[PDB]
């Protein structure tokens with residue numbers, strides 16, 4: 001029997017989501033199982049659970065981000081540069097690999113979208129505009145990003161069947177960790193500025209592993225290692241949402257733990 005919105009809302013309440021909360025979801029729709037009206041049922045349930053004063057923030061990215069195609073170059077390669085679509089926050093689809101729910105979130109009426117094409121974040125609620133801007137190239141997940149503001153806004157990370165690798169906020173810990181050997185990447189994104197496409201090349205922390213030992217293609221990366229340790233060490237509300245084992249994590253606490261975890265293991 002497909003899960004109804006009301007059932008999901010009651011499950012979210014049982015897990016500890018309260019009216020007014022600031023929630024960042026990471027969802028495995030396969031784990032959740034069939035929904036009465038598809039993924040929108042869970043989006044609607046999340047919005048109802050946080051209520052009209054609550055907020056949702058999601059890391060949605062962009063289906064067509066030219067990350068791999070520009071990585072490591074000081075400028076976009078010529079063929080990429082000529083024909084790639086500029087990122088248009090109103091129309092650019094979300095990246096499927098971070099969750100199929102994200103396209104439903106980003107298309108929800110009133111959703112706001114951040115300007116960073118690769119790190120794009122979507123937000124719903126009264127504080128959405130404050131969450132999503134600024135979001136500048138060179139500030140993907142660290143200071144001055146939407147994640148930074150989420151962490152200052154009592155954020156909760158709602159993992160619905162997602163693994164420990166899924167915790168985007170822990171890229172903030174990587175950004176600020178006082179450790180030697182941190183990896184950086186250079187890439188280029190096509191932005192709209194006053195209606196025109198402008199290529200911007202930037203560097204930022206490597207979000208595929210902050211040190212060499214965390215940068216294997218298949219992992220585990222530092223986010224996964226930190227989150228697994230944290231979850232083995234901390235009381236965290238656990239329970240079902242749909243068919244999915246879910247957890248509700250204090251974001252500031254896990255990020256503080258992650259900064260300490262990295263700094264304990266790696267010389268300054």
Ligand SMILES: NC[C@H]1O[C@H](O[C@H]2[C@H](O)[C@@H](O[C@H]3O[C@H](CO)[C@@H](O)[C@H](N)[C@H]3O)[C@H](N)C[C@@H]2N)[C@H](N)C[C@@H]1O
Pocket residue numbers: 061065067068118119165166168207208209216217218219220221223224
């Ligand atoms: N390195 C291992 C991890 O790789 C992925 O996550 C990571 C993604 O690969 C990162 O994505 C970035 O790198 C990928 C891969 O090149 C690009 O497709 C993407 N546009 C770009 O944003 C994203 N910015 C952060 C995320 N933690 C897996 N989802 C989880 C895994 O633990």
Ligand SMILES: [Mg+2]
Pocket residue numbers: 053126127
């Ligand atoms: Mg408020």
